[PDB]
Amino acid sequence: PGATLCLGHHAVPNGTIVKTITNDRIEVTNATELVQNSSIGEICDSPHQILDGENCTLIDALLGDPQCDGFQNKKWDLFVERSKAYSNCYPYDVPDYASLRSLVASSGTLEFNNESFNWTGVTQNGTSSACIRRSSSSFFSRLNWLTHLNYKYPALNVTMPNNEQFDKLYIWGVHHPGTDKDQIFLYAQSSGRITVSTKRSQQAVIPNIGSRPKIRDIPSRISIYWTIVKPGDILLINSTGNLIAPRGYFKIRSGKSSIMRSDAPIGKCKSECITPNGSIPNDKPFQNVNRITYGACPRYVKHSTLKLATGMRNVPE
Amino acid sequence: PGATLCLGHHAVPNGTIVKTITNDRIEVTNATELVQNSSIGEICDSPHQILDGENCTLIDALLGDPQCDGFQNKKWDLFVERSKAYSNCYPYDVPDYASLRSLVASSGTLEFNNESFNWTGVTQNGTSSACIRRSSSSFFSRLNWLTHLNYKYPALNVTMPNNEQFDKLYIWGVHHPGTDKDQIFLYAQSSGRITVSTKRSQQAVIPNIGSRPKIRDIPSRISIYWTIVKPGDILLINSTGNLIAPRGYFKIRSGKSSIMRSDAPIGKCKSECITPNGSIPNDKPFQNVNRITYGACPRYVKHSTLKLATGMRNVPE
Amino acid sequence: PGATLCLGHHAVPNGTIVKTITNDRIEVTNATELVQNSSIGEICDSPHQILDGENCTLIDALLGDPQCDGFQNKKWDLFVERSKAYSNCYPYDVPDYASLRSLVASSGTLEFNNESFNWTGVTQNGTSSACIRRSSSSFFSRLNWLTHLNYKYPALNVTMPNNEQFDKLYIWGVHHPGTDKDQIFLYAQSSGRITVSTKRSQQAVIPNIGSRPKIRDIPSRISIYWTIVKPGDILLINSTGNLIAPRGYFKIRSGKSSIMRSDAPIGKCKSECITPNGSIPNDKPFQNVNRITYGACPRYVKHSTLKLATGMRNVPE
Ligand SMILES: CC(=O)N[C@@H]1[C@@H](O)[C@H](O[C@@H]2O[C@H](CO[C@]3(C(=O)O)C[C@H](O)[C@@H](NC(C)=O)[C@H]([C@H](O)[C@H](O)CO)O3)[C@H](O)[C@H](O)[C@H]2O)[C@@H](CO)O[C@H]1O
Ligand SMILES: CC(=O)N[C@@H]1[C@@H](O)[C@H](O[C@@H]2O[C@H](CO[C@]3(C(=O)O)C[C@H](O)[C@@H](NC(C)=O)[C@H]([C@H](O)[C@H](O)CO)O3)[C@H](O)[C@H](O)[C@H]2O)[C@@H](CO)O[C@H]1O
Ligand SMILES: CC(=O)N[C@@H]1[C@@H](O)[C@H](O[C@@H]2O[C@H](CO[C@]3(C(=O)O)C[C@H](O)[C@@H](NC(C)=O)[C@H]([C@H](O)[C@H](O)CO)O3)[C@H](O)[C@H](O)[C@H]2O)[C@@H](CO)O[C@H]1O
Ligand SMILES: *[C@@H]1O[C@H](CO)[C@@H](O[C@@H]2O[C@H](CO)[C@@H](O)[C@H](O)[C@H]2NC(C)=O)[C@H](O)[C@H]1NC(C)=O
Ligand SMILES: *[C@@H]1O[C@H](CO)[C@@H](O[C@@H]2O[C@H](CO)[C@@H](O)[C@H](O)[C@H]2NC(C)=O)[C@H](O)[C@H]1NC(C)=O
Ligand SMILES: *[C@@H]1O[C@H](CO)[C@@H](O[C@@H]2O[C@H](CO)[C@@H](O)[C@H](O)[C@H]2NC(C)=O)[C@H](O)[C@H]1NC(C)=O
Ligand SMILES: *[C@@H]1O[C@H](CO)[C@@H](O[C@@H]2O[C@H](CO)[C@@H](O)[C@H](O)[C@H]2NC(C)=O)[C@H](O)[C@H]1NC(C)=O
Ligand SMILES: *[C@@H]1O[C@H](CO)[C@@H](O[C@@H]2O[C@H](CO)[C@@H](O)[C@H](O)[C@H]2NC(C)=O)[C@H](O)[C@H]1NC(C)=O
Ligand SMILES: *[C@@H]1O[C@H](CO)[C@@H](O[C@@H]2O[C@H](CO)[C@@H](O)[C@H](O)[C@H]2NC(C)=O)[C@H](O)[C@H]1NC(C)=O
Ligand SMILES: *[C@@H]1O[C@H](CO)[C@@H](O[C@@H]2O[C@H](CO)[C@@H](O)[C@H](O)[C@H]2NC(C)=O)[C@H](O)[C@H]1NC(C)=O
Ligand SMILES: *[C@@H]1O[C@H](CO)[C@@H](O[C@@H]2O[C@H](CO)[C@@H](O)[C@H](O)[C@H]2NC(C)=O)[C@H](O)[C@H]1NC(C)=O
Ligand SMILES: *[C@@H]1O[C@H](CO)[C@@H](O[C@@H]2O[C@H](CO)[C@@H](O)[C@H](O)[C@H]2NC(C)=O)[C@H](O)[C@H]1NC(C)=O
Ligand SMILES: *[C@@H]1O[C@H](CO)[C@@H](O[C@@H]2O[C@H](CO)[C@@H](O)[C@H](O)[C@H]2NC(C)=O)[C@H](O)[C@H]1NC(C)=O
Ligand SMILES: *[C@@H]1O[C@H](CO)[C@@H](O[C@@H]2O[C@H](CO)[C@@H](O)[C@H](O)[C@H]2NC(C)=O)[C@H](O)[C@H]1NC(C)=O
Ligand SMILES: *[C@@H]1O[C@H](CO)[C@@H](O[C@@H]2O[C@H](CO)[C@@H](O)[C@H](O)[C@H]2NC(C)=O)[C@H](O)[C@H]1NC(C)=O
Ligand SMILES: *[C@@H]1O[C@H](CO)[C@@H](O)[C@H](O)[C@H]1NC(C)=O
Ligand SMILES: *[C@@H]1O[C@H](CO)[C@@H](O)[C@H](O)[C@H]1NC(C)=O
Ligand SMILES: *[C@@H]1O[C@H](CO)[C@@H](O)[C@H](O)[C@H]1NC(C)=O
Ligand SMILES: *[C@@H]1O[C@H](CO)[C@@H](O)[C@H](O)[C@H]1NC(C)=O
Ligand SMILES: *[C@@H]1O[C@H](CO)[C@@H](O)[C@H](O)[C@H]1NC(C)=O
Ligand SMILES: *[C@@H]1O[C@H](CO)[C@@H](O)[C@H](O)[C@H]1NC(C)=O
């Protein structure tokens, strides 16, 4: 009689199809998905420090648009800019806007220190009905609109040394009046000049007079510039008109901070990986949710599914 | 007596050498080449819509150099620029030429809609012997050279609303006269100013007077600028001299269009993949013909040959 | 009785741990390191031609700062810039400094040919106590500071044809005086204009008057520009003041030359691969010494060690 001894292996009734080098569809006992394809639709507020911009762009929070006063001196790991955001102060532009936005985002702080420039011979604190703060005509909080005093605008030549151990970021601008009359009414002379310099840089700007389309009834514009002043260096502002002066400096830091455009709500939860769609889990090595990511994130790929076999070939009877 | 039964495999008299992980040269029964190394030397005119630039750059076709009048309102998937191309109109430059070329190429259309600006107080339609159209002094078709009327150039302040559902691309410029006399002869005053703006952008230009080397006897130059006007926005042109005005706007589209520099002839044939050398077949995954490609193309690699084994090791007797 | 015949394999007492696809730590008989992790701490002077900048940046050697006179007409495969380098001539800046540095570095030569411009009506060879050469007030060797002659600065309109078979690189500048008085004292009129052009390019610059912080007692600044003139083209310089003129042109070549920032000493030895840390051997395919490399170099990776098995699994008794 004797015996029979058979060697064999398991199988399952519910196998999974995977791809290999030689076969686009082969059934195995089990697999695991390597492409994360969903978000929870909210940005978790831990572990990254999230600052919700609400109605404010980062640049408006920097300059000090009145609706952004709550952002003064705030810090973030990730600043979230919303598509509903709008400007509601004096009309302005920023040559190389994207660069100023990037460098502030990456710095992660709006910490601002006031400095006394001792502006002498000019009127300070110019305001506009385009920039309403507490029902009164106002202006960007961090900027100082200088105009004539007694129909004289005497040449400004002002120094501010950096005696600190850190870099200072100065934000300033040039006012472009809508007409030649407005140039006189504000600066009591026909041609402004601004030169802002350090030992290692110089920026010279000429206003360009002319009508731009009216925003909150203003055909004029301000153009925003920035200057970084290193320790041991000196800021030198030399101007005969059209200066929108700084009130102080921002701390500029280095670290892990950034900015992201998203309409996802902020949630009370923990997730290392943030996308504009919301936080996503980061167990899987890849994801197809969004190319835009912040934190410890799976790598973006253009595959909806990649199944890794975790078992042998499934061979049912 | 019994029998012998031998197991074995085929071989061929004409084997092919391939590379593996362990051997740089090993003979197999057959292989296939994975690097496409040739073109047919012509750009096939299907399935992509090809527009042969002939003597015209895309920028000259845009501005309306007289030799390019046949390109008015044409559309393309791929615009082909030839090395024989030359300019034959008023001498000009384009600050960020490469960007204007790119954005027009990518748009894929020179569709142009005329608009009436109602220029009042100035002479329109200035011409030059540097730009001959039908044996007569002429000018860029899409540009309007404004000069004084009765030795007055009254300030221009003109609006053009965008009430359409699409974006408008405006092309305009500034004339830089060769001398201070020419400035007077043309604009009847010493200092032109141009400000072109929308609600969301501003461009201010000052002419720079001086002699450039003479091209078709002209020591002056035009510098070309562009402005995109979104729906609900307004173009505002404010100028006291030196304006080379737009005659209307170009449609700006998004899609799959591009531009390529090539001297290859156009052929009547079908090929998905275009290179400057000519169309190439796209069966193989890689190619060493050209890094520059358009369409469904093999990936460029720096290998002249990569043979994929399609058979076993060849072991002749 | 009979016999026993045992098949087997070697083992070693000192095996090495490697990683595989299925096991992060498995012992093999031998391995080799694929990541080069050290430099010899000196830049070997063969086979690449090395030029040690010493106290000079490449840009200072180009302009002709007095401490850099030893670099006139020198050539390099790799220019080495040291962190101790400092400028000691007239204070200047270069709009797009990084681009001028790159294009000169890549060219590999400071070969300079003098040309006679025949400046008539102006004083040549202006000097400054900010730029001392042999205990005397001097200036950048390759630049010519033109000022008034007999309180007239007659308009300059000068040509220089390129009748050579190669491209010419012209370096020139604009002087920005510290005050309106200095503008008069130097150029005998209130508003300088510079226009430098060829048949295919134009650069127009306006000086910007104003105080910058004093460097070697100078509140003024020069801004440096460049112009490439092709064979058959012509340089045209047209100016009414504030021109810092070229004395000739640099040869601009193409080849394998570059520039590197390093404090490593130069050594008498041979090594194909240079990093800022020093030369490294290039037997291994990868390295973690520095992302910055020049020559035949292993590829930079973020791994400290990658051991390639060169023997079987080690299975001691
Ligand atoms: C210097 C001055 O008071 N100039 C008067 C013009 O402002 C005025 O033109 C009207 O200005 C209207 C808006 O007015 C303000 C504003 O923005 O709210 C008033 C501000 O006090 C003034 N700011 C400063 C620091 O002087 C500001 C500024 O002049 C403009 O913003 C520059 O463009 O203007 C509004 O724009 C009207 O449409 C406009 O007509 C004229 C005539 O009304 O009188 C001027 O004396
Ligand atoms: C406004 C005017 O007519 N000015 C006269 C100068 O053009 C002229 O200088 C000569 O100009 C020659 C080329 O002449 C045109 C041209 O480009 O064909 C004639 C055009 O009608 C004129 N265009 C307009 C809209 O006015 C145009 C323009 O003035 C220039 O292109 C600007 O640079 O010039 C050629 O360049 C000669 O070399 C040049 O001497 C002078 C003296 O001849 O008379 C002026 O009244
Ligand atoms: C044209 C002239 O001689 N102007 C005199 C001013 O230079 C002078 O101001 C003082 O200038 C001091 C430095 O002087 C030089 C220099 O850089 O060494 C002397 C040079 O010859 C001159 N170069 C040329 C080509 O003229 C040069 C130039 O004027 C300046 O560099 C432009 O900024 O100046 C130093 O900066 C002192 O701090 C400054 O007061 C005034 C009064 O002293 O007299 C002017 O006539
Ligand atoms: C199919 O394979 C997957 C992947 O190994 C298994 O999922 C793991 O299950 C363990 C135990 O439940 C968990 O701790 C892990 O989190 C899971 N890993 C992953 C990557 O998801 C799954 O259990 C297997 N299915 C069967 C029937 O064995
Ligand atoms: C230049 O033209 C514009 C457009 O007509 C003028 O601005 C308009 O002015 C009217 C009347 O005050 C306002 O109702 C409109 O809101 C303005 N439109 C825009 C688009 O701004 C402008 O005032 C003119 N410039 C000058 C200096 O008179
Ligand atoms: C920078 O500030 C200086 C110093 O205040 C200005 O120079 C003065 O300008 C006034 C008005 O033009 C003159 O009356 C004085 O004679 C000048 N003073 C000196 C010491 O020269 C200069 O105008 C300012 N420059 C700019 C670009 O605004
Ligand atoms: C995450 O957000 C992205 C970006 O919004 C989504 O992709 C876009 O979806 C819209 C409308 O469904 C398409 O018209 C766009 O073409 C998509 N953009 C891109 C850049 O691909 C994406 O579907 C979202 N993913 C998840 C999982 O919610
Ligand atoms: C060598 O292998 C190649 C690749 O499989 C074979 O080429 C294919 O041949 C079939 C039938 O003729 C064609 O339909 C395919 O277009 C070819 N494929 C490729 C990638 O070129 C070739 O026939 C084989 N040679 C032999 C002798 O069997
Ligand atoms: C500035 O100099 C240039 C160069 O000499 C002058 O342009 C030349 O003028 C002559 C005589 O008309 C022509 O034959 C040449 O073709 C011109 N050469 C170039 C390179 O353009 C120019 O006219 C001078 N500028 C002024 C305002 O007189
Ligand atoms: C923009 O257009 C406006 C309005 O036409 C110009 O302002 C007029 O300019 C003339 C000439 O200088 C003056 O006589 C008028 O008094 C101005 N009108 C008004 C209502 O202020 C202005 O000059 C133009 N601006 C530019 C930059 O060209
Ligand atoms: C396709 O065109 C490219 C670009 O013209 C050819 O490569 C160039 O060939 C010239 C002259 O033979 C060389 O001097 C250049 O160095 C090459 N350029 C580059 C960027 O490599 C290429 O040989 C052509 N290929 C085919 C198959 O026709
Ligand atoms: C361990 O393996 C390495 C790599 O093959 C051996 O190193 C080689 O040794 C030969 C002969 O000494 C040299 O010519 C090569 O330069 C070495 N190659 C590398 C990549 O370093 C080493 O000899 C082996 N060890 C043992 C005990 O066999
Ligand atoms: C503008 O202000 C600066 C700063 O006070 C003046 O430059 C200083 O001048 C003093 C006196 O000569 C020197 O001791 C300092 O070295 C200078 N400081 C700096 C930072 O440059 C400058 O002279 C003023 N401008 C004018 C035109 O008077
Ligand atoms: C370029 O050079 C030309 C020619 O020398 C200059 O034109 C002369 O300028 C002077 C002074 O303004 C006048 O008196 C002459 O009448 C002009 N000559 C001619 C032939 O027109 C011109 O000023 C210079 N341009 C620049 C921008 O510097
Ligand atoms: C080679 O040089 C690099 C760059 O200096 C060294 O890496 C830096 O080391 C410093 C101080 O040890 C760190 O603070 C920096 O973060 C490092 N920089 C970067 C970009 O990583 C590197 O250690 C040197 N390597 C060797 C082998 O000498
Ligand atoms: C944002 O702006 C909208 C519309 O003006 C307003 O209703 C809303 O209250 C604002 N939200 C905040 C948080 O300021
Ligand atoms: C301007 O306003 C600032 C901030 O409110 C204040 O510190 C300062 O006293 C004001 N200065 C003048 C001159 O009005
Ligand atoms: C292109 O220019 C050349 C040289 O001027 C001319 O002979 C040729 O006919 C032109 N071709 C076309 C299609 O315009
Ligand atoms: C200018 O030329 C255009 C296009 O040919 C024409 O429509 C217009 O009537 C001309 N206008 C004047 C004022 O000459
Ligand atoms: C470089 O500068 C330092 C400090 O001024 C000086 O001591 C040294 O001799 C200089 N070296 C050379 C080679 O010029
Ligand atoms: C200026 O100096 C250069 C170089 O030393 C010399 O060739 C020339 O003769 C000088 N020219 C004048 C006008 O002083």
How would you sum up this structure, described in words?
Chains A, B, C: It is found in: Host apical cell membrane; Virion membrane. The structure is a homotrimer of 317-residue chains. The first copy, chain A, is mainly β. Chain A has a domain at 49-264: Alpha-Beta Complex (Hemagglutinin (Ha1 Chain), Chain: A, domain 1), CATH 3.90.209.20. In chain A, 8% of the residues lie in helices and 36% in strands. Chain A has three helices and 30 strands. Chain A has helices at 58-63, 97-107, 180-187; strands at residues 16-18, 26-28, 31-33, 35-36, 43-46, 50-52, 78-81, 92-93, 112-114, 122-123, 128-133, 136-138, 143-145, 147-148, 156-161, 168-176, 194-197, 202-205, 221-229, 234-239, 243-246, 248-251, 258-261, 266-270, 273-275, 278-280, 286-287, 294-295, 299-300, 307-309. In chain A, strands 8, 9, 13, 16, 19, 21 and 22 form a seven-stranded mixed sheet that branches. A four-stranded antiparallel sheet of chain A has the order 15-20-17-18, with no helix packed on it. In chain A, β1 and β2 form a beta hairpin. The longest helix of chain A is centred in the N-terminal third of the chain and has 11 residues, at 97-107. Chains in contact: A-B, A-C, B-C. Bound molecules: a molecule of 3 linked components (NAG-GAL-SIA) (3 copies), a molecule of 2 linked components (NAG-NAG) (12 copies) and 2-acetamido-2-deoxy-beta-D-glucopyranose (6 copies). A molecule of 3 linked components (NAG-GAL-SIA) is lined by residues 126-130, 137, 145, 147, 177-178, 182, 185-186, 217-218, 220 of chain B. Residues 30, 32, 310 of chain A line the site of a molecule of 2 linked components (NAG-NAG).
